[PDB]
Amino acid sequence: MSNISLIVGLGNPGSEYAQTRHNAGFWFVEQLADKYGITLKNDPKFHGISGRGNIEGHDVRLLLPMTYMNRSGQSVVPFSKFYQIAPEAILIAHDELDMNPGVIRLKTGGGHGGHNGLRDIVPHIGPNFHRLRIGIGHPGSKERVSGHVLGKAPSNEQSLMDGAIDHALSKVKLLVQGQVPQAMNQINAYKPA
Amino acid sequence: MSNISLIVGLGNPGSEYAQTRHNAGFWFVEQLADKYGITLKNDPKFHGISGRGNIEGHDVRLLLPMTYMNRSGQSVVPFSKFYQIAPEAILIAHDELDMNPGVIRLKTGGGHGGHNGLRDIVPHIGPNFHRLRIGIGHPGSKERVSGHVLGKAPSNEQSLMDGAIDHALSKVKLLVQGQVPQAMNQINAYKPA
């Protein structure tokens, strides 16, 4: 219903990318999977890694596309179709250039905002999924964006992002129970200690 | 049979990667294509961009995989199988960490040397293809490699690499005419300073 039943984390595959800012969504979903003991396994049918299990009394699917970022729809679209999961029940976690490290927000609907992973998904399932926007900062010009997203953050910025991710992990119960306005209020209020 | 009939350039797709060091092979092959007026077109059957045309009186195919670097074999392997092109007729251009900017070498055989594009090719066609190793320099350490290869070189290093590329472009006639030992001698003699 209102319940979130599929949580997708966006990113690029491989150790070359695992610590880069554009993998913020993977960070969230990997951490969530292990918090609840959900195993993520190779799922080549859907060009991803996926898992299923109990989160706070609800049966939730977790997916990490292994398509590379700009081809994420190649995994999210057939996966959500095969399992008959509506967009309204999908949360997609992703890096957000338009928010600073330590800033995190839940959004419902809207466009891709120039994020090329979201750009590969919105055309196929429409815009009405939820997004956990994990701030990574904007380096201050268009030409610097690639090196920023494909770069590793310095430790002080990494700690800010990690704190925000930890806070959002604590609110997943509200999301899987369908209490989305309350999740939004509680996530969006986060400020680093 | 000594004639090179397929020239592959390794790299990652998209404007976010086009200027990065790991795309050195793309630079070579794009420049070669335009030097001889060979159009590179979308070739979705082989998960790449490809062209064919006359280079110095020989009918030569050009391929840029669009698989992302670590899945390059997904393009090179079926392409070479479909056209029945033996490894000994294949030249693969790629960035080389273990040579400095301005250094360029033609090599035949051997392993991948930790290059993850070549790592996806050697298992399927074997090692006996030729390689144009375009020096990109090595940053201090294993952990710095990803940021180096997915980064843009400063202008002084870019000049050195471009000079080396231009020199190799000048020797392609020898390669496609089957004079490989002479091409090797003449490419490998290049001094960037």
Q: This structure's resolution (angstroms)?
A: 1.7
- Paired with B50 in beta bridges are B41, B63
How far apart are the C-alpha atoms of A168 and A165, rounded to whole Å? 5
| Superfamily covering domain B1-193 | Peptidyl-tRNA hydrolase (3.40.50.1470)
Nearest residue to B163 (alpha-carbon basis) of B110, B83, B111, B103: B103
- Which of A72, A150, A152, A155 is the best mutation test for B, with the most CBs of B within 10 A? A150
Token pair, residue B122, equals 């050697």
Q: Tell me how far CA of residue B29 lies from CA of B102, B109, B127, B152, B163, in angstroms.
A: 17, 20, 21, 18, 15
- Would you tell me how many other CB atoms lie within 10 Å of the CB of residue B42? 9
Reading phi first (left if > 0) and then psi (alpha if -120 to 50, else beta), residue B153 is in beta
Interface of B with A in 133-172 (CB under 8 A): 145-147, 149-152
Q: B157 with B101: CB under 8 angstroms?
A: yes
How far apart are the C-alpha atoms of B182 and A116, rounded to whole Å? 46
Q: Which amino acid, residue A3?
A: N
* Residue listed under structure tokens 């590969």: A120
- Paired with A90 in beta bridges are A6
Residue A185 C-alpha, separation from nearest chain B C-alpha, in angstroms? 35
Nearest residue to A191 (alpha-carbon basis) of A163, A153, A149, A151: A163
How far apart are the C-alpha atoms of B67 and B125, rounded to whole Å? 17
Q: Tell me how far CA of residue B17 lies from CA of B11, B26, B64, B66, in angstroms.
A: 8, 10, 14, 12
How far apart are the C-alpha atoms of B102 and B137, rounded to whole Å? 9
Residues of chain A neighbouring B14 (CB-CB closer than 8 A)? 70
How far apart are the C-alpha atoms of B127 and B110, rounded to whole Å? 6
Using a 10 angstrom Cβ sphere, with 0-12 exposed, 13-18 middle and 19 or more buried, the burial of residue A6 is buried
Nearest residue to B77 (alpha-carbon basis) of B4, B44, B126, B110: B126
- Would you tell me how many other CB atoms lie within 10 Å of the CB of residue A141? 8
A70 → closest Cβ in B14, B70, B151: B14
Give the residue on B whose Cα is nearest the Cα of A15. Answer: B146
Q: A106 with A131: CB under 8 angstroms?
A: yes
Token pair, residue A191, equals 């400020």
* Domain residue spans of chain B: 1-193
Could B20 and A146 be called an inter-chain contact, meaning their C-beta atoms sit closer than 8 Å?
yes
Taking the Cβ of residue A14 and every Cβ of chain B, the question of whether any pair is shorter than 8 Å is answered with yes
Strands (E) in chain B, as ranges, are 6-9, 41-43, 48-55, 58-65, 90-96, 104-108, 130-135
The technique by which this structure was obtained is X-ray
Residues of chain B neighbouring A146 (CB-CB closer than 8 A)? 16-17, 20, 152
Nearest residue to A149 (alpha-carbon basis) of B64, B14, B116: B14
Q: Tell me how far CA of residue B125 lies from CA of A32, A77, B128, B159, B178, in angstroms.
A: 41, 33, 8, 34, 20
Q: After which residues is chain A broken (C to N over 2.5 A)?
A: none
How far apart are the C-alpha atoms of B46 and B42, rounded to whole Å? 9
| List of residues 6+ apart from B187 with CB closer than 8 A | B104, B105, B106, B132, B167, B168, B171
DSSP secondary structure string, B24-67?
Answer: HHHHHHHHHHHHTTPPPEEEGGGTEEEEEEEETTEEEEEEEE-S
| List of residues 6+ apart from A86 with CB closer than 8 A | none
Token pair, residue A53, equals 């299990």
Reading phi first (left if > 0) and then psi (alpha if -120 to 50, else beta), residue A44 is in alpha
Is B185 annotated as belonging to a binding site? no
- Would you tell me how many other CB atoms lie within 10 Å of the CB of residue B57? 9
Nearest residue to A121 (alpha-carbon basis) of A79, A158, A83, A82: A79
Interface of A with B in 56-85 (CB under 8 A): 68, 70
Is B17 annotated as belonging to a binding site? yes
How far apart are the C-alpha atoms of A49 and A42, rounded to whole Å? 4
How far apart are the C-alpha atoms of B45 and B75, rounded to whole Å? 9
Q: Tell me how far CA of residue A88 lies from CA of A109, A124, A150, B36, B188, in angstroms.
A: 9, 14, 30, 52, 59
How far apart are the C-alpha atoms of B112 and A84, rounded to whole Å? 43
As a dihedral over the C-alpha atoms of residue A12, residue A17, residue A22, residue A27, rounded to 10 degrees, the angle is 90
Relative to beta strand B90-96, strand B6-9 is parallel
Q: A176 with A58: CB under 8 angstroms?
A: yes
Nearest residue to B59 (alpha-carbon basis) of B85, B79, B81: B85
Q: B189 with B181: CB under 8 angstroms?
A: no
Q: What is the three-class DSSP state of B19?
A: coil
Give the residue on A whose Cα is nearest the Cα of B19. Answer: A146
Token pair, residue A183, equals 């999740």
- Would you tell me how many other CB atoms lie within 10 Å of the CB of residue B109? 12
Q: What is the three-class DSSP state of B135?
A: strand
Could B70 and A17 be called an inter-chain contact, meaning their C-beta atoms sit closer than 8 Å?
no
